[PDB]
A = this chain, B = another copy of it.
């Protein structure tokens, strides 16, 4: 469901 586990890299 995209490319990676979340969005970008890290939170914030």
Return chain B residues, CB-CB under 8 Å to A5.
2-4, 6-8
Interface size on A, residues (CB 8 A): 12
Inter-chain CA distance A7–B1, complex, in Å, is 12
Q: Which of B2, B3, B4, B12 contacts A12 (CB 8 A)?
A: B12
A2, A5, A12 pick with most chain B CB within 10 angstroms = A5
Return chain B residues, CB-CB under 8 Å to A1.
1-4
17 A-B contacts, Cβ less than 8 Å apart? A1-B2, A1-B3, A2-B4, A2-B5, A3-B5, A4-B7, A5-B8, A6-B8, A6-B9, A7-B9, A8-B9, A8-B11, A9-B10, A9-B11, A9-B12, A11-B12, A12-B12
